[PDB]
Amino acid sequence: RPAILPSGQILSNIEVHSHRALFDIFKRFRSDDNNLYGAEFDALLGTY
Amino acid sequence: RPAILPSGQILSNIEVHSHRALFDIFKRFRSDDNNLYGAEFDALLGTY
Amino acid sequence: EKASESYFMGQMQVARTESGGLHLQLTQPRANVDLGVGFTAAYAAAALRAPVTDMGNLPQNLFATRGAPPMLDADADDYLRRTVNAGNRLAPVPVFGQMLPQVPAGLARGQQSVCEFIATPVSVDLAYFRRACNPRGRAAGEVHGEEGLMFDHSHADPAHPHRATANPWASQRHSYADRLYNGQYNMSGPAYSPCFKFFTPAEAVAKSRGLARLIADTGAAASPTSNGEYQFKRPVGAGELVEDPCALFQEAYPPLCASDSALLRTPLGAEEHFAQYLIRDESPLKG
Amino acid sequence: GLMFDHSHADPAHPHRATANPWASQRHSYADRLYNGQYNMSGPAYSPCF
Amino acid sequence: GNQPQEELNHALADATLLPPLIWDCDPILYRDGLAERLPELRVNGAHFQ
Amino acid sequence: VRPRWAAPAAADQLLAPGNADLRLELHPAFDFFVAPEVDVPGPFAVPQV
Amino acid sequence: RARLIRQVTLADFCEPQAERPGLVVLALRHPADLAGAAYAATPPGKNHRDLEEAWLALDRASVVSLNFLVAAAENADDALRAHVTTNYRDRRTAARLERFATVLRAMIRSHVFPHRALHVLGGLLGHVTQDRLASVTCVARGDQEAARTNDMAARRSQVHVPACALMDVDRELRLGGDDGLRFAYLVFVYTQRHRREALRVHVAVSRLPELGDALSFLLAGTRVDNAIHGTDEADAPAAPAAAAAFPAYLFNDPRSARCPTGRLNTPAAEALPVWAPDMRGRATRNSCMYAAYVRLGTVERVVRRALPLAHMERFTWDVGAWEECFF
Amino acid sequence: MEVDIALPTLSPGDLSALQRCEGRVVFLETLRRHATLREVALPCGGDVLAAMAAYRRRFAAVITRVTPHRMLATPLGVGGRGQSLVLQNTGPFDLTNGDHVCLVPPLLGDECLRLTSANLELRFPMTLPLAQARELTARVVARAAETLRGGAPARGADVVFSNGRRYQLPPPHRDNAEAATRSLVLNMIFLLNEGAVILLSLIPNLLTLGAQDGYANAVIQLGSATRELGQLVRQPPPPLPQDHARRFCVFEALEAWIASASRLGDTLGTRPVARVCIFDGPPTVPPGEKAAVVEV
Amino acid sequence: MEVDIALPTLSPGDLSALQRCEGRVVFLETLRRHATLREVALPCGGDVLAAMAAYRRRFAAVITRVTPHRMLATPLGVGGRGQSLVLQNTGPFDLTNGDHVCLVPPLLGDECLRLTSANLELRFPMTLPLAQARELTARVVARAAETLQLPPPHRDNAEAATRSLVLNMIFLLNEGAVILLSLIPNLLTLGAQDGYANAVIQLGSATRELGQLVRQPPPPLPQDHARRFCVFEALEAWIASASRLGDTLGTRPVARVCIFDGPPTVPPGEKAAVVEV
Amino acid sequence: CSTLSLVRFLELGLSVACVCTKFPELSYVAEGTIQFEVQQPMIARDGPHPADQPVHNYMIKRLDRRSLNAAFSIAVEALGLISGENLDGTHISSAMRLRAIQQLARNVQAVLDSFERGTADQMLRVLMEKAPPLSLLAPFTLYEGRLADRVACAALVSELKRRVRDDTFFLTKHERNKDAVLDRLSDLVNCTAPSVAVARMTHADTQGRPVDGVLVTTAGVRQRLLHHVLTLADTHADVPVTYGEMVIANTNLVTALVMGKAVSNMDDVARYLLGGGSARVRADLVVVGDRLVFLEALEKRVYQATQVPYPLVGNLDVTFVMPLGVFKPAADRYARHAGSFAPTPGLPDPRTHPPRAVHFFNKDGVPCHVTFEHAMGTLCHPSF
Amino acid sequence: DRVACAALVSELKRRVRDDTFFLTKHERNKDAVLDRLSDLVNCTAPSVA
């Protein structure tokens, strides 16, 4: 779910928790949560 | 969301509506449903 | 058939632990999936070995069941206990912690079955027991009849258009025989009830959307009974594969029986003599 | 423990417990004549020994 | 029930089921003695004088 | 309590695995019962021995 | 290795710069629920708000070093009082010790015993202190010297117990035994005489896995004088009625008055004998409570060496649950 | 010894709810490295006594991370060196640092997951500090008892404190508190009365001694050495011939009482299963929030 | 820690019999690292009550290896709760997976590996599940209370058991307990409209024999029936007592059975893995 | 000593009942699916009622998760000898070490074998649960297309109720006839339907056309069949000796990592969308009807000398019912012959009273009768 | 377990009194004799080679 290859760097840092209004989803975990390292996919094997 | 390339052909035919209980989910339609024609995707347009 | 199953085997892995010694416990995950529209396998049940359980008699004892309000004069039901539990196995001996039937000693044959008794007027026609019948009289079941047929009485009995039922005390909603062998009346005990599946509509939640569903379901329905020295109730989780066409028809077969031993003799002859009667054997076990 | 007690029913006809109150209990009449450790043994053979 | 077995077994052994025709008080005098089930007989509104 | 001998025991329910007669019925020519540990005949009132 | 606990708190009772590491610390309950449970727990006759007042007279602070608590009891050797008083940096300290004494003496009077107010943690090893705010750190399992203190003079530590309170048992009871691995128990001793009562603390070691009869005999005088002066201030009625004698002759009476089941109402239930078990002012269990103990761990050796002290030897922290000692 | 549980795929939305219970405990059956969710399931409307008795014949295990495929558990009974683990407190009131937790069924108003897609329910037992649990059980039982005799139905003092805040002890009719607890209060009150009766039958003159000088003296003599005031237990009257319908052998009754009391005392928990050793966190964990624990 | 039990010289007639005792438990008295065999030894069978009282005063130890010189052991519980070891069952009832086990002195005697060369005998205690050990202790203590496959008591220690029992029972009587004692008829009447309510009450209940024979009046209001409430206190006290009544007469369950692969139920005379508590 | 009979799963004829492919990343996949599409033909009617359009329909079947496992415990006394910690410098400890390592090898040899008989058992466990009985299967296939109105469903259930109770035990109640057995076997073989074709099976006869199915039995029934009714076809068959493969690589990887799915034939879909060793094993065949199937009874090659029951001894279940004390109406009591079971002269006839017991034969044949008084367990209880 | 040995001995009791004599009770069923001989041969087990 997270990104693999960033495209553009950000020139200016800012406090993010102030500007929650500009964003549509917002998730801020402390440090190294457990969800990032789940590689669990699902797909069709064969069609007929 | 139909298949594009079938892996293998089915050998035998059978009245399938009667044996519907074997399958988990399915759907029949008269002929040439409009839904399976337009297929639109959702793309993320840049990560940062 | 040539290719009836896809079979995917994963990757092995070796988990260690300590137990005196060292327990290496292998494990390999694998999955399969049916890939043939319609059926792809069948079996016939050709031969027959000895019946794994005895086909004798064992009068079921209710005194292991609770939920029935007792009788006021405690001496009365004390006498009931003191006399009916006498000379009756599977009596709830109050040995520590369980108050369960004591472990019997020695077995004649396979595990002994259990018998029930359902009230019925004396003027029930006898010919209803020659062919395969339903202990209720309303032969509802599910396969032949839509929902609402199991307890209605403004609609005829499908298997006997003549009457409405054949046993008033055993068919009506909230009738007597219902209040003892039903699914949701909390009057079950540790002993198995061979008629538990005949007075139960709780499968109303499991509505049947195809005869093939019931067909495939029969022949592989997990076992409801135990495997000890009796027919005890078993947790539904464990189970075991067993075949029974009863739950598809909800019908029972009459065994070879007669109201006098003097009728069951090698020169069988007449089948109705006097008040005493005989019932020929019409079952899947003609030999 | 199945041979002399009379609370566990007869394991061949489980209706009753015994089919003969005069030949099944320990120290019964029919027992004191054909038991191996009561020693009324004579010269003739005894099929029910 | 302070009654021998016979009165519980049959229905006409009860000392509490009055006969349909009585000429005296002998059955009634026997009736009230069984309070294990509160009995009562109403004669025109009075118990009996 | 009722004396077992007078009130008849049973026809089939005697040979049941529980009753208190099989324990004392094991010879066709002799009976076995319990009695006060006294000499016979003894005094009028039954002693609690 | 061993497992640790860190609890930031106030520097009122345990003062981790004043003592060096290696001494057991206790966790103090929130006092609000103690003051509340008193309202329903103090026995009849006694005061029912005096613990409220005793607490209000001492005004979160959560830990208390055993070195501090042992001083605020009856049993103590005045050398340790002098040490706690003149060696603690803190202001107003002796006054606080006095108030704490009054608190515990109120606790036993109100039948909410301090053993239900002091869970035990391990021995502290480290601390960082602001101005009157500390964060102590104590072991919780494993052996003490698996830790690592930031002293740099003695990385590891031991366990120190005031030798004034350490009461040995085996050599006391003369079991004739031979010292091997012995358990370690922290025990409390209550005594109940209204407005004249106190609390005694001890630290007991022995091979006895089950104290029980051992303390019941050790504290014989306490149990004796506690069972008789404990019911005081409770109005007992006059001489007990003869109807209080529970009739036993009537159980296996063949001929006796009897009642049909389910009819305890107005219908003829009068001929039954009356029996009034009436128990008002007799010694209840909480009245005969005299001691309470809790297992601490296992010990090799105890040596005495200096203020007198008692260095443990290979203490393995294994804390258990509390226990009553009333019978 | 970490077990995984096959998970019959349910749906979106519900799987989020299953993900939210990443800290509770579940009672397995046997230590096998595989198990089906259908196995660890209990009808969330159930008898509290039978559930508390069954909690012994099982193994506790906490739900670690979950995935649409499976969920991982870690048993608490067996273990190596008692490693740390996380636990979601789910009692009615918080628990402090440095104490012992106990596992009791949802005695008060119940909460239960209703996985409507798979058609099964789950019960997750409460997590209580030791003394507070041993007192809450008595609270609910005593309220039911006071109600039983039809006396004053309320006294305004069925409240329990924990770290300041006052708790209300929700009204005893919410889910089935008038039905799923009847068994417990009956089985406890009855045994208490029976013990009292047996004692008084063995010592008939106990409650006719001095109100303050006789009873205390008897108790202190009994606790001390072998005087015992002779056979303080007077010889009970001789029984009936064991067929008389009114036989009463007191000693067999005492035997049955000892057995039943021991059994009931063992099927009550109150033997700690874990101990909070939180570190690097707020010293007081509120309900619903995880808390570092080491198994005992 | 590994207790080391040294052995004297032994005849081959009994060394090979001692080899077969690889999963049974013995009772030391002190936990030194070394100890001679002669020390850990109990006299021949007698007074199962006294012996059961003695197991409380000593901590157990199970043995693992038996060499021609040396015989190891393991102190069962002093600091550990997960030292998974194996010990063989020697009680009649087969113990199944899941439940705890408690040590109980042997009955009838006859279990004595009588060593003639060393001139001593051992009596290894049997291992029973909790549910049945409780009942056995109940039976034996009741039989001891009677005297004011079965051995008779000794009248010198049976009084101690009686004392413990009568104390634990006496301290149940509280001014709150009488309030509960007041609703015996209100309990019996409740045990009539329903089935489970009647089920919980036993048959020789020793209370139904009372509620139908004696009437008791309304209880006297205790001192300050407004501030405090007594039923709660009496019930809390009773819970606290009953939670620890079983062990005070018998012995705490010492270990619970866990098996990862083998068949669930293990028969008598066969070793089975375990974890201690 | 004793050897250890090794067995490979691909040699057995049961392999031709399934396709086996290693999928080394199964431990990662969530619930996978497979998509079917099927297109039922149609015939042109005529007349008043309008015609219909040819129908289409899709479907998917999800997977299910199973697993194998086996314990491999070794002890401490030998663990100290393997790793050399407990090793001593002697000429005697060396031999004990040799013994210990040989033991470990002879142990791992057995535990590795179990993962072949594991599949041999799992395939039977699976197939045994999806195959409905033949009795309930023939007439349902005879009534296809008419199960819309109720009356046809009734005509179908009235025939199921007979097929269950009459065609359920052959070769035990028919031991005089021969072609009835073979014809029942033909119905069994021909009532199913062929599944998808795949080129990876190639399970061929020694000479010609490929095989179609298997026939697993218990040794007794196989013995009874191979000497009266069925003639052995041949004694060998060329089979595949390798598995298949489904791996994730270089196109499935990007999609599985960023999107969350990965189709198996992804490379084919890609290259189309944008432009872009047979072994010989001694198996025993048999010809039935017009087909050719493997005939086995695996009770010996596998499952032998172990602790598991054979999954081919199933369990039938019947519920009997007998009336106890019914009394026939007046107009139905009659002696078939005037010379009746005449009782002893001088005493009255108890054959007129209402009967109060039933007599039935037990499992072996000794009669055991049920009388009213046995119902005391029911008709004497407050529940009444 | 008991349930297995029960049916085992119950089938043994039937196997004794039916198949203790062949080629004297059944000379008509010529093939049944060869059946029984094949059973007799295959029922045993090979020893070490």
- DSSP string covering I44-94, please? SS--HHHHHHHGGGS-EEE---B-SSEEE-EE-SSS-S---EEEE--SSSP
**Secondary structure of chain E: what % helix, strand, coil (to 5)?**
20, 5, 75
**Chains in contact with E, counting 3 or more C-beta pairs less than 8 Å apart as contact:** C, G
The answer to whether H126 touches H160, Cβ cutoff 8 Å, is: no
Please compute Rg for chain F using Cα positions: 14
Structure determined via? cryo-EM
Nearest-CA residue of chain D relative to J370? D15
J61 Cα to chain A: minimum distance (Å): 10
G with K: 3 or more CB pairs under 8 Å?
no
Residue I164 has phi, psi (to 5 degrees) of: -55, -45
Tell me the chain I residues in contact with residue G39 when contact means C-beta distances shorter than 8 Å. Answer: 227-228
The amino acid at residue G235 is: D
Angle between helices H215-223 and G220-228 (to 10 degrees): 170
Residue H251 has phi, psi (to 5 degrees) of: -70, -40
Q: Which of I97, I99, I196 is nearest residue H183 as measured by Cβ atoms? A: I196
Residues 6+ apart with CB under 8 A from K20: none
**Chains in contact with J, counting 3 or more C-beta pairs less than 8 Å apart as contact:** A, B, C, D, H, I, K
Nearest-CA residue of chain C relative to I274? C19
Helix (H) or strand (E) holding I5: strand I4-6
Chain-chain contact of I195 with C67 (C-beta, under 8 angstroms):
yes
Q: With H, G, I as helix, E, B as strand and everything else as coil, classify residue G236.
A: coil
Residue tagged 């009213």 (tokens):
J372
b/e for C156-184, b at 16 or more Cβ within 10 A?
Answer: ebebbeeebbbbbebbbeebebbebbbee
- Kindly report the number of other CB atoms within 10 A of residue J43's CB atom: 4
Distance CA J263, CA J268 (A): 10
Distance CA H293, CA H270 (A): 18
C25 Cα to chain H: minimum distance (Å): 9
CA dihedral over H88, H92, H93, H95, signed as positive or negative: negative
Query: What six digits make up the tokens of K19?
Result: 């198949």
Distance CA C82, CA C90 (A): 15
Residue tagged 């553009």 (tokens):
A8
Query: What six digits make up the tokens of G276?
Result: 């009034």
| Interchain CB contact of I260 with J (< 8 Å) | yes
**Chains in contact with F, counting 3 or more C-beta pairs less than 8 Å apart as contact:** C, D, H
| Interchain CB contact of J3 with H (< 8 Å) | no
Q: For chain H, what is the HEC assignment?
A: CCEEEECCCCCCCHHHHHHHCCCCEEEECCCCCEEECCCCCCCCCCCHHHHHHHCCCCEEEEEEEECCCEEEEEECCCCCCCCEEEEECCCCCCECCCCEEEEECCCCCCCEEEECCCCEEEECCEEEEHHHHHHHHHHHHHHHHHHHCCCCCCCCCCCEECCCCEECCCCCCCCCCCCCCHHHHHHHHHHHHHHHHHHHHHCCCHHHCCCCCCHHHHHHHHHCCCCCCCCCCCCCCCCCCCCCCCCCCHHHHHHHHHHHHHHHHHCCCCCCCEEECCCCCCCCECCCCEEEEEEC
Chain-chain contact of J366 with D13 (C-beta, under 8 angstroms):
yes
Angle between helices H130-148 and I230-242 (to 10 degrees): 130
Where does residue J268 fall: left (phi above 0), alpha (psi -120 to 50 degrees), or beta otherwise? alpha
The amino acid at residue J276 is: G
Query: What six digits make up the tokens of G164?
Result: 């004034």
Residue tagged 């041993």 (tokens):
H134
Residue among A43, A27, A45 at smallest CA distance from A35: A27
Chain-chain contact of C54 with J136 (C-beta, under 8 angstroms):
no
Distance CA I261, CA I29 (A): 36
Q: H26: which strand partners?
A: H61
Residue among H162, H101, H92 at smallest CA distance from H294: H101
Helix (H) or strand (E) holding I208: helix I208-211
The answer to whether H30 touches C46, Cβ cutoff 8 Å, is: no
| Interchain CB contact of J195 with H (< 8 Å) | no
Chain-chain contact of I227 with G278 (C-beta, under 8 angstroms):
no
Residue among J168, J137, J164 at smallest CA distance from C215: J137
Whole-angstrom CA distances from H291 to H84, H122, J1 are 11, 22, 59
Tell me the chain I residues in contact with residue J77 when contact means C-beta distances shorter than 8 Å. Answer: 65
- Kindly report the number of other CB atoms within 10 A of residue C242's CB atom: 16
CA angle H40, J124, K8 (to 5 degrees): 90
Mutate to test the interface with I, among G51, G250, G280, G301 (most CBs of I within 10 A): G280
Interface residues from chain B to A (CB-CB < 8 Å): 3, 5-10, 46-48
Residue among H158, H168, H166 at smallest CA distance from H135: H158
**Chains in contact with G, counting 3 or more C-beta pairs less than 8 Å apart as contact:** C, E, H, I
| Number of CB pairs, chain D paired with chain F, less than 8 A apart | 37
Tell me the chain H residues in contact with residue C27 when contact means C-beta distances shorter than 8 Å. Answer: 33
Distance CA F39, CA C160 (A): 76
Q: With H, G, I as helix, E, B as strand and everything else as coil, classify residue J307.
A: coil
Residue among J302, J282, J135 at smallest CA distance from J218: J302
Distance CA H26, CA H124 (A): 7
Query: What six digits make up the tokens of C91?
Result: 């009596």
The answer to whether H123 touches H23, Cβ cutoff 8 Å, is: no
**Chains in contact with H, counting 3 or more C-beta pairs less than 8 Å apart as contact:** A, C, F, G, I, J
Tell me the chain A residues in contact with residue H66 when contact means C-beta distances shorter than 8 Å. Answer: none
Query: What six digits make up the tokens of K4?
Result: 């297995």
Distance CA C15, CA C26 (A): 6
**Chains in contact with B, counting 3 or more C-beta pairs less than 8 Å apart as contact:** A, C, J
Residues 6+ apart with CB under 8 A from I2: I33, I72, I73, I74
| Interchain CB contact of I194 with J (< 8 Å) | no
Distance CA C47, CA J169 (A): 6
Chain-chain contact of B21 with C37 (C-beta, under 8 angstroms):
no
| Number of CB pairs, chain C paired with chain H, less than 8 A apart | 12
- Kindly report the number of other CB atoms within 10 A of residue H220's CB atom: 17
Q: G323: which strand partners?
A: G293
Distance CA D6, CA I172 (A): 44
C with F: 3 or more CB pairs under 8 Å?
yes
Residues 6+ apart with CB under 8 A from K34: none
A48 Cα to chain B: minimum distance (Å): 5
Tell me the chain C residues in contact with residue D17 when contact means C-beta distances shorter than 8 Å. Answer: 87
The answer to whether H112 touches H42, Cβ cutoff 8 Å, is: no
F2 Cα to chain H: minimum distance (Å): 9
Query: What six digits make up the tokens of J290?
Result: 């017009």
G272 Cα to chain E: minimum distance (Å): 16
| Interchain CB contact of C17 with I (< 8 Å) | yes
Residue tagged 């069988």 (tokens):
C268
The answer to whether H19 touches H66, Cβ cutoff 8 Å, is: yes
Tell me the chain B residues in contact with residue C212 when contact means C-beta distances shorter than 8 Å. Answer: 18-22
Q: How would you classify the pairing of strands G4-9 and G24-28?
A: unpaired
CA dihedral over E5, E8, E14, E15, signed as positive or negative: positive
**Secondary structure of chain B: what % helix, strand, coil (to 5)?**
5, 10, 85
F19 Cα to chain C: minimum distance (Å): 8
Tell me the chain C residues in contact with residue G261 when contact means C-beta distances shorter than 8 Å. Answer: 72-75
Distance CA G34, CA G28 (A): 11
Distance CA J117, CA J5 (A): 12
Residue J329 has phi, psi (to 5 degrees) of: -60, 170
Distance CA G122, CA G23 (A): 8
DSSP J284: -
Helix (H) or strand (E) holding C16: strand C13-17
Query: What six digits make up the tokens of I54?
Result: 């003695």
Distance CA G138, CA G124 (A): 4
Please compute Rg for chain K using Cα positions: 15
| Annotated resolution, angstroms | 4.4
Residues 6+ apart with CB under 8 A from G302: G166, G168, G205, G310, G311, G312, G313
The answer to whether G269 touches I217, Cβ cutoff 8 Å, is: no
The answer to whether C31 touches J66, Cβ cutoff 8 Å, is: yes
The answer to whether C105 touches D10, Cβ cutoff 8 Å, is: no
Nearest-CA residue of chain J relative to I192? J382
Q: Contacts for C179-182 with beta carbons within 8 Å, 24 or more apart?
A: C179/J383, C180/J383, C181/C116
Residue H276 has phi, psi (to 5 degrees) of: -75, 125
Chain-chain contact of C210 with B10 (C-beta, under 8 angstroms):
no
Distance of CA I137 to the CA centre of its chain: 7
Interface residues from chain H to A (CB-CB < 8 Å): 65, 67-69
Q: I74: which strand partners?
A: I62
Helix (H) or strand (E) holding J120: helix J93-130
Nearest-CA residue of chain J relative to B33? J56
- Kindly report the number of other CB atoms within 10 A of residue I24's CB atom: 19
Tell me the chain K residues in contact with residue J3 when contact means C-beta distances shorter than 8 Å. Answer: none
The answer to whether G65 touches G15, Cβ cutoff 8 Å, is: yes
Chain-chain contact of C23 with I203 (C-beta, under 8 angstroms):
no
Query: What six digits make up the tokens of G321?
Result: 């649950």
Q: Provide the strand spans (E) within chain G.
A: 4-9, 24-28, 63-65, 118-130, 133-139, 142-143, 166-168, 182-191, 198-206, 291-299, 303-304, 310-311, 316-317, 322-325
I with E: 3 or more CB pairs under 8 Å?
no
Where does residue C98 fall: left (phi above 0), alpha (psi -120 to 50 degrees), or beta otherwise? alpha
b/e for H1-32, b at 16 or more Cβ within 10 A?
Answer: bebbbbbbebeeeebeebeebbbbbbbbbebe
| Interchain CB contact of F16 with D (< 8 Å) | yes
Angle between helices I230-242 and H250-266 (to 10 degrees): 90
Query: What six digits make up the tokens of K30?
Result: 């010529």
- In terms of DSSP H, where are the helices of chain C? 74-84, 211-217, 246-249
Helix (H) or strand (E) holding I166: helix I158-170
Distance CA J165, CA J187 (A): 18
Distance CA H286, CA H277 (A): 15
D with F: 3 or more CB pairs under 8 Å?
yes
Burial class (CB within 10 angstroms; exposed 0-12, middle 13-18, buried 19+) of H102: buried
The answer to whether G54 touches G102, Cβ cutoff 8 Å, is: yes
E with F: 3 or more CB pairs under 8 Å?
no
Tell me the chain D residues in contact with residue C104 when contact means C-beta distances shorter than 8 Å. Answer: 8-9
b/e for H52-75, b at 16 or more Cβ within 10 A?
Answer: bbebbebbbbbbbebbbbbbebbb
DSSP G58: T
Query: What six digits make up the tokens of A8?
Result: 């553009």
Residue among I236, I171, I165, I128 at smallest CA distance from H254: I165
Tell me the chain J residues in contact with residue K14 when contact means C-beta distances shorter than 8 Å. Answer: 364
The answer to whether H54 touches H29, Cβ cutoff 8 Å, is: no
Q: Contacts for J145-152 with beta carbons within 8 Å, 24 or more apart?
A: J145/B15, J147/B18, J147/C211
| Interchain CB contact of E8 with C (< 8 Å) | no
Query: What six digits make up the tokens of J201?
Result: 């099976």
b/e for G103-128, b at 16 or more Cβ within 10 A?
Answer: bbbbbbbbbbbbbebbbbbbbbbbbe
Helix (H) or strand (E) holding J156: helix J150-166
The amino acid at residue J134 is: L
| Interchain CB contact of A14 with J (< 8 Å) | no
